[PDB]
Amino acid sequence: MKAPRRQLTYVTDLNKCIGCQTCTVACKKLWTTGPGQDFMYWRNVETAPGLGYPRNWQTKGGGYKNGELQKGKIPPMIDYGIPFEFDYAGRLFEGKPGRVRPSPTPRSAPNWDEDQGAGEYPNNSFFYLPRMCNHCTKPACLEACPNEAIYKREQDGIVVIHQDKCKGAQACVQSCPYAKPYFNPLTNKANKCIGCFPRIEQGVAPACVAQCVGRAMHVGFVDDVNSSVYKLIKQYKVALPLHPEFGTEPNVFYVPPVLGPRIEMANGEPSTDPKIPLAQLEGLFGKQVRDVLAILQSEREKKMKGLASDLMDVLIGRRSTDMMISPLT
């Protein structure tokens, strides 16, 4: 497989993601405008808790156990959601009566369960989880590809599926535990997030990062000690990878949400528990989140007393260049 000279790394701040779906649109309006790509959202944001995109992708299968490769399910098209199509021209211009209904009958969609979450009023809880290709150090897709069509670049660690070597084996879609490769039924090929390597080769951050409206996306190379990505992952150690039990070691990381109101007791008074259950942040990111929440909580208390906290200043990112590769283009 070979190891790359540099590994491009992302950090998503779940304390700032507003779930506005801008990163989703910027990726789709740039990379997934092609034939057979209408259902593919390489960059997608989903509500946690929820079933995600595609539906139930966390029980799908793939990644690694005991160093051993698992072949999970190939999600049917209904789990990704049939993209709704409409006959506007008939109603608006051609005098055809009847509402412009979506086809098919809505039963699934990438963002179907937006802000439903879990828990009863007044303790309902949810937050947003922007997902993408993790560009893992142990890519399970690359490992499964029996044509060796996928490859990991030596320059920036990005994983790209070679569209000429790809013969449609779909083994990458079986063995990826994040369901980020998508089989294109019109080209009989697998398409996936390309990590914006044409933009990074020119020194411009990825579209999901550069166009992140919530100002929650971080990008850079972890070998650079001046990158906020390094400081959040290596120095302050508040950024964790999504689902590390898959054994793939992702290269995109998450700061767990420390903002949020507390559980409301039956008398209306607040308790110590936040509305976001720790048991859920554990199920997503493992056992370290409790220590990370304490570091974030402790450092935010410093700012509340008018004191200094360099970890907060990294998350705040008063200047976008302190956050990412230059987003100007």
Partner: protein, 895 residues
């Protein structure tokens, strides 16, 4: 490896996807408040994509604005090549609303409008023609096209600030300004923020990053929303009262602050009216005319504790400013003419409490009391936290702690929105929010104040926009009050009985006595209706009354639009307007202090024209319709104006000087102190910041915050009292029981069990982007309406079922999203989807009537007078109550 890796050759398939041969500056001209700077990327004459330019010069020590943008803006080019786009002028051949058209030439379509327009002036009146074009800050050149057109032919324009409910009606009553707020960068300067009926995670997307970054910088945020909305997941405190009961929460917070002596007494003595003396006999302000012969009715008294004598406060309505200034649009009077430090408290010590005796001309002594005294006595009795707990559903101790925290943190700031402004009694509610701000003394301080955020409603360079839109004078222009306009011509039944609130009495007396307008005059019907840059029919409250009663009264309805919206679908002629990336226009907002713009990435597509060039093309057809019909000049006695329709094009262009889109845009900048010196080329390169503002001096590197001309420079407030006026001793205010801030329970005239909420969704900018295919695939395929499972379960309603909402005004059938964050007893349908979307009948506005608060009709009380978008009836709709039923005509299974 040589110098390129094994696969560099093929990877050009991806490098070519992110390529272009042309980059231009583009903006999205929708009522969004974003105004975000973008770059447009074209290749081979085809716009490929758009992206935030991220070129706003940051302010020191505060996070930068960039990237800005949103999910709708990053696919705004879908309206260039999508199936909704109008390509040619369309003439209706079927019935209104059927979508049965015949393609027509511009000449045929512009002749037909010119023929009917000239007919309407001749046989009826010029004010039977009207033009509706909203929020000029979004596209001021396009706004000025149809308004300048109506300006010279005699048609009447409309209002929108109030008709939408964006107008902080309670702020104009208190401060005498049209409405102002700090730019969102100053949210970072705050220590305690209250998101009060505001959901900025969905409704302030390009600006919402300052809130979380403030909390990561030590600040605290509170969310006051009946539902656990998207923004609440980040705040530190969540208060969820019953819908519309926020006034009882605010007044109970004032009680605690006043009882526990937490307020800024000096700020109260200087900048407020609570020290003004009120007579205990007539409940009126004690006036100079009451005590001194030849005294002014617009001069009052406070009691000075330093001298033990009554003193006339300085700068009220009867006090003139020596050397006057010109009237300012966003002010009741031009108090900027007064010298600096005019209302400086100095050595004065106005008493806030106490009883005193004053004796008048007539011989009798009367007991007088300061406004702060009467308010305190009513707060201690009526507005205790325990009594507010039984009204709002928020515990008295949570109410007490919220008040102690709001008064202690400095600075503290209230950010309110549609959740608190779109109620029938939202004026008295914002007055309660201004009282809480006045008590804490945070108005005019960075990180403090009472800040409102609604539509894109602040054109800072209003003077230059006035010059392009109404060249011969805003006093030589007809305006209707569109909330009144719709209510009357659509023959709305607002379900409010006359013995409770006699709306018809207040409405008619206001009109026949000149306080509010009613056009067309003499009771004539409206006949011609120009709709562009707004989806008037789809967004209109009282929509079912409009379709049945007003819409038939119009003989010609023209819609100039880039797409086929619901208004154009029900129109007689639809004209294609150029896309945002095909036109030249300015674009500004109140959320940040920069001038954004759009420029043509390519030529206007198909047969489309820009709004400015459309009304110029129609001006020449009307020039010749008048020639043919021998009605070229006519006398308009309302302004003593012999109009010349034969020379309309020269009046539209200043004899050709403003014939082109960039010329009119430069004319706006050249005639306003906020932007003079800025040219189009400067804006084409980098977004330029304003050079001045409205109610404060704009300072380099410091976020703007309003009202600092009065709180810092001590110029009088443009109110009848010259101060922040909380006592409004008008007859109509006594009748409604709101002479002071107090709790007014929401309207229950709709005898139905569910309160009907309709907030704004992150998935669209009003009706625009509702029918965007990418937006619908990011939801459930169509419109949505939300219920709590505690209400849907006894009704047999499952998630994604069709549900049926109705009251006496209409009925809507829509698919439901059951949400645990939804509060029981209320249902939230994201406001105004297009009628042709996934709705089985009607829309959100079918269940909404048009209601008029009599306090919004007052036009003879100092700073309370009609000015287009400065005062007038608000188009509230959050009091609406509906019933919910499961629609069983279709029950699809889920799998």
């Amino acid at each position: 490896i040589s110098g390129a890796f094994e696969y560099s050759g093929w990877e050009n398939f991806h490098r070519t996807q992110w390529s272009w041969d042309k980059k231009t500056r583009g903006a999205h001209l929708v009522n969004c408040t974003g105004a975000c700077p973008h770059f447009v990327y074209s290749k081979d004459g085809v716009v490929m994509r758009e992206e935030q330019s991220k070129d706003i010069a940051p302010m020191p020590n505060i996070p930068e604005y960039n990237p800005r943008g949103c999910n709708k803006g990053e696919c705004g080019h879908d309206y260039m090549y999508g199936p909704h786009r109008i390509k040619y002028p369309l003439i209706r051949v079927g019935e209104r609303g059927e979508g049965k058209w015949r393609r027509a030439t511009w000449e045929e379509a512009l002749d037909m409008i010119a023929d009917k327009c000239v007919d309407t002036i001749k046989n009826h009146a010029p004010d039977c023609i009207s033009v509706y074009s909203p929020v000029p800050a979004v596209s001021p050149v396009s706004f000025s096209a149809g308004h300048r057109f109506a300006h010279y032919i005699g048609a009447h324009a409309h209002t929108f600030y109030d008709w939408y409910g964006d107008h902080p009606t309670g702020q104009t009553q208190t401060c005498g300004v049209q409405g102002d707020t700090c730019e969102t960068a100053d949210w970072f300067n705050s220590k305690y923020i209250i998101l009060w009926g505001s959901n900025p995670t969905q409704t302030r997307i390009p600006d919402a990053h300052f809130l979380s970054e403030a909390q990561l910088n030590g600040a605290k945020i509170v969310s006051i929303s009946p539902d656990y909305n998207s923004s609440t997941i980040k705040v530190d405190k969540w208060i969820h009262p019953q819908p519309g009961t926020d006034g009882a929460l605010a007044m109970a917070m004032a009680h605690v602050i006043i009882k526990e002596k937490l307020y800024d007494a000096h700020s109260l003595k200087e900048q407020t009216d609570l020290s003004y003396l009120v007579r205990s006999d007539t409940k009126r302000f004690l006036r100079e005319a009451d005590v001194v012969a030849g005294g002014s009715k617009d001069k009052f008294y406070f009691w000075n504790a330093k001298t033990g004598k009554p003193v006339i406060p300085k700068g009220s309505w009867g006090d003139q400013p020596e050397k006057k200034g010109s009237p300012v649009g966003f002010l009741g009077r031009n108090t900027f003419a007064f010298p600096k430090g005019y209302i400086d408290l100095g050595d004065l010590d106005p008493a806030l409490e106490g009883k005193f005796n004053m004796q008048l001309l007539d011989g009798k002594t009367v007991e007088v009391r300061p406004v702060f005294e009467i308010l305190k006595s009513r707060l201690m009795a009526d507005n205790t936290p325990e009594k507010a707990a039984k009204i709002t559903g928020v515990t008295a101790k949570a109410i007490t702690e919220l008040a102690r925290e709001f008064a202690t943190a400095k600075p503290s700031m209230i950010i309110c929105g549609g959740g608190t402004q779109h109620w029938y009694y939202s004026d008295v509610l914002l007055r309660a929010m201004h009282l809480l701000t006045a008590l804490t003394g945070t108005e005019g301080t960075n990180g403090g104040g009472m800040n409102h955020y609604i539509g894109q409603e602040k054109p800072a360079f209003v003077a230059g926009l006035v010059a392009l839109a109404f060249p011969e004078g805003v006093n030589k222009q007809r305006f209707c009050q569109t909330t009144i306009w719709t209510y009357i011509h659509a023959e709305v039944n607002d379900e409010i009985i006359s013995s409770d609130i006699d709306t018809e009495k207040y409405l008619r007396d206001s009109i026949t006595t000149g306080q509010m307008p009613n056009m067309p005059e003499q009771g004539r019907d409206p006949k011609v209706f120009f709709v562009y840059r707004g989806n008037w029919l789809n967004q209109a409250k009282g929509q079912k009354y409009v379709l049945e009663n007003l819409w038939p009264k119009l003989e010609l309805i023209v819609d100039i639009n880039i797409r086929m919206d619901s208004t154009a679908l029900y129109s007689d002629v639809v004209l294609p307007s150029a896309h945002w990336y095909e036109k030249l226009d300015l674009n500004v907002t109140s959320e940040h202090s920069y001038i954004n713009m759009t420029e043509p990435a390519i030529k206007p597509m198909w047969e489309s024209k820009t709004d400015w060039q459309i009304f110029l093309a129609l001006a020449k057809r009307v020039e010749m319709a008048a020639k043919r019909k021998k009605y070229e000049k006519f006398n308009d006695e309302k302004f003593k104006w012999v109009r010349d329709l034969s020379n309309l094009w020269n009046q539209m262009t200043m004899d050709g000087k403003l014939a082109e889109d960039e010329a009119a845009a430069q004319y706006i900048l050249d005639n306003a102190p906020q932007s003079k010196g800025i040219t189009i080329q400067m804006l084409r390169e980098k977004p330029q910041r304003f050079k001045s503002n409205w109610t404060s001096p704009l300072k380099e590197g410091v976020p703007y915050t309003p009202f600092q001309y009065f709180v810092v420079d001590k110029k009088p407030w443009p109110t009848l009292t010259g101060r922040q006026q909380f006592y409004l001793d008008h007859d109509t205010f006594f009748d409604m029981g709101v002479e002071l801030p107090t709790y007014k329970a929401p309207i229950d005239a709709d005898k139905y069990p569910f309160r009907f909420n309709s907030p704004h969704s992150r998935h669209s900018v009003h009706s625009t982007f509702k029918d965007n295919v990418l937006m619908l695939r990011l939801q459930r395929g169509g419109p949505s309406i939300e219920m709590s499972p505690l209400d849907a379960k006894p009704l047999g309603i499952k998630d994604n079922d069709w549900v049926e909402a109705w009251n006496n005004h209409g009925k809507v059938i829509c698919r439901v999203k059951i949400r645990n964050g939804e509060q029981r007893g209320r249902v939230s349908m994201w406001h105004c989807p297009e009628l042709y979307m996934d709705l089985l009948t009607g829309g959100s506005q079918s269940v909404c009537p048009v209601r008029i608060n009599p306090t919004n009709l007052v036009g003879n009380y100092g700073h309370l007078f009609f000015r287009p978008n400065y005062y007038g009836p608000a188009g509230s709709q959050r009091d609406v109550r509906v019933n919910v039923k499961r629609y069983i005509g279709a029950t699809p299974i889920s799998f």
